[PDB]
Amino acid sequence: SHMMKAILQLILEKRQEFEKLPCFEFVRDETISPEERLILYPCIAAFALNFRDLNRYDYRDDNSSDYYQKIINIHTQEDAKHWEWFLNDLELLGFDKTMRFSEALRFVWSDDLLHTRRLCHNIAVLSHDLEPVMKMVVIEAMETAGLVIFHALAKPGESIAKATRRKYLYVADSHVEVETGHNIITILEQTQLSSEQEEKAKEIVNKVFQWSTNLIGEFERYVKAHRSEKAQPTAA
């Protein structure tokens, strides 16, 4: 059992199962119009800005002298910028519609977006008392699940971007390329964990992908319940 080969293999095993979820088969289906495949886009509003705060305030610790924490801090500086990309594509896709303040509040805190809204909350609770090397396991599992989601979402996104000649930033290949280079993974490959640390790392990987699966399930149920609320992008 060399080093953290078992933990990294567990992440790869969870990733292959996560990739086969029915919501991703729907998003990758080029026989369906990309505007209908991005019906789930407004659901990300309950996550994208919570993810910003997760990287700003929960992962990050600008006062610590730990070298592993400083590498985490640099990693969070990049991920904390992507919320503006979400709001950019929100307007481009025609989902930045006008509404009452309370209607926006009821949408974000809707019971149908519970798992989406509480994903970053659960991650922060899990990672509050972890040592920096254990925080990296949380981040690495989170980055792996996110790359799966945006590798699929970029397919209808780039189709709309090309057809409308607009520059998309969130559901786009440029977002995927930044996430692909997400070094934390090099430290994990060279880190030896104790028996207690390895058991905790397995729990981390299981919880992250279980919570991510719950979020994807909410995305699929939203598409079924809002099958007519397709994206409405404009051409340039």
Ligand X SMILES: N[C@@H](Cc1c[nH]c2c(Br)cc(Br)cc12)C(=O)O
The footprint of Fe ion (CB under 5 A) covers 79, 82, 143, 179, 182
CB atoms within 10 A of CB 50: 20
For residues 103 and 208, the answer to whether their CB atoms sit within 8 Å is: no
Chain centroid to CA 45: how far? 12
* 130 touches a copy of itself by CB under 8 A: no
Among 108, 147, 169, 178, binds a copy of itself (CB under 8 A): 108
Residue among 51 and 209 whose Cβ is closer to a copy of itself: 51
Locate 123 and state its tokens.
């991650």
- Beta-carbon count within 10 A of 162 CB: 11
Q: Tell me the torsion sign for CA atoms 169, 170, 171, 177.
A: positive
* Partner whose binding site includes residue 6, from Fe ion, ligand X, a copy of itself, none (CB under 5 to 8 Å by kind): none
Q: Which stretch binds ligand X (CB under 6 A): 9-17, 20-28, 142-150, 193-201?
A: 142-150
56 annotated ligand binder: yes
Contact 58, 128 (CB under 8 A): yes
151 is in an annotated binding site: no
Using CA atoms, how far apart are residues 64 and 146, in angstroms rounded to an integer?
Answer: 27
- Report the alpha-carbon distance of residue 127 to residue 106 in Å, rounded: 28
Q: Does 142 bind ligand X (CB under 6 A)?
A: yes
88: its two tokens: 């950019």
149 binds ligand X (CB under 6 A): yes
Do the annotations mark residue 37 as ligand-binding?
no
Distance of closest approach, residue 156 Cβ to a copy of itself, in angstroms: 20
Determine, following the binding rule CB under 8 A, whether residue 77 of this chain makes contact with a copy of itself. no
Query: Does 48 help bind ligand X (rule: CB under 6 A)?
Result: yes
**112 annotated as ligand-binding:** no
Nearer of residues 36 and 96 to a copy of itself, judged by Cβ: 96
Using CB under 8 A as the binding rule, the residues of this chain from 53 to 72 that contact a copy of itself are 53, 57
